[PDB]
Amino acid sequence: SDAQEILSRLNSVLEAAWKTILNLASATDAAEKAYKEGREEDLATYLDQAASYQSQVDQYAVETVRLLAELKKVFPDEEADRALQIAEKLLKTVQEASKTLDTAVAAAANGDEETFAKAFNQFVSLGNQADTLFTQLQRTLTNLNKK
Amino acid sequence: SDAQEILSRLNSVLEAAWKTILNLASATDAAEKAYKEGREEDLATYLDQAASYQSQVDQYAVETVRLLAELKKVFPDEEADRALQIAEKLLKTVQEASKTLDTAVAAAANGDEETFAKAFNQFVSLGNQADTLFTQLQRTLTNLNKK
Amino acid sequence: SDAQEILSRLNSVLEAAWKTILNLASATDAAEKAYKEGREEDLATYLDQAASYQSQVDQYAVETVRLLAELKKVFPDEEADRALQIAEKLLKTVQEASKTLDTAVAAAANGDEETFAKAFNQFVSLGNQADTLFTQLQRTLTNLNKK
Numbered sequence A, B, C: 001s002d003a004q005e006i007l008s009r010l011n012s013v014l015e016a017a018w019k020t021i022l023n024l025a026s027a028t029d030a031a032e033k034a035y036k037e038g039r040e041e042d043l044a045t046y047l048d049q050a051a052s053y054q055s056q057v058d059q060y061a062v063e064t065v066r067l068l069a070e071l072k073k074v075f076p077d078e079e080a081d082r083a084l085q086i087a088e089k090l091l092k093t094v095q096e097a098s099k100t101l102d103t104a105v106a107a108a109a110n111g112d113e114e115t116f117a118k119a120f121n122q123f124v125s126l127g128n129q130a131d132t133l134f135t136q137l138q139r140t141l142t143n144l145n146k147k
Ligand SMILES: CNCc1ccc(-c2[nH]c3cc(F)cc4c3c2CCNC4=O)cc1
Pocket: A021, A024, A025, A028, A029, A054, A057, A058, A094, A097, A098, A123, A124, A126, A127, A128, A130, A131, A134
């Protein structure tokens, strides 16, 4: 069915997105270590890498919203509505994280530790929020694969 | 000179390799954290990322040996021999690290934690050794460049 | 998760891996020809291609073990354990091939033809051994999929 096809694309997207989120977390941790150690060139590299993974998470989140809306058209279902709303909240959250990371990139580039530290802590806080939403989304998708 | 073009290609390779090494170090450190925390599936992902970066380091190390072999051929004397020997020792060390990572990856996949941990700790030690050789190579090449 | 998803991912992994193996064999054969004809720059290109494909085979072999390890946790029978054991031996063999290719690539870059030729012939012999295990693994999975 088209519903099975869409669900199969969604499972692949979310599997890929979780790997990318792991990469984003590792790059964020490495940036934090460089920052603590006063290694500004390492820090700049790790922020660029984090931003690369962040841009990829953002695109997976876009794809997930699109696919869940497509699912709702062919296979209306309480769970699909619920998933789409979580996915839309995640998309907003990851975009906010992207903006905050950009602020951290610019602050490091400008050598403004105070602006950097505030942005970087906000980035991590958004990551905790996004992680919760991603967990909620994953559970909703599991409940969708059992329908 | 063709020599100073070779030296230029070398500096570009080593710059690219250092970026990959920073990525490999972050992946290795994330793998260690996942291992400490008992996050088996996350550990697998970080080990796969490390393996991908490791293959890129190996390729750069091969290219560096090749470029220094080419530099030695344009020299009437043995000016480039020391750099070549250092680069060959770096390549040997990164390939040892790659073999050791293979052992660790297989052990983690096979659920053999004692073997995994021995190999993982050896991998980190080889990383410290390779880092020492890499910085030595960079200094030796700066000496071959006119400024 | 889910044995039917696991078996389907496994089939996809082995289909992809077989294509990569075919490409590895073509690169290996081109490297042998370049060696015999004395074209060392061609040999370098083919060895680099082989190294790339080998790293991909290694990754697919790891994935295969991990999938079959999952299958054995979900359906713990002798037939699952048998399939996993073949896949673990395949992974061991491909990682030995990888270590041997590393030796050959370093020898070719270091201009040590005697070591290169010995390691290259060992590489091919390990490839024929891995091919036997790969085909055995396919036959085992046919019993597991049951059409
Ligand atoms: C100690 N680790 C700090 C940390 C904690 C969380 C994250 C994280 N998790 C996410 C999940 C998710 F679905 C999306 C994002 C993230 C992050 C960094 C923020 N950005 C995300 O896109 C990054 C770093």
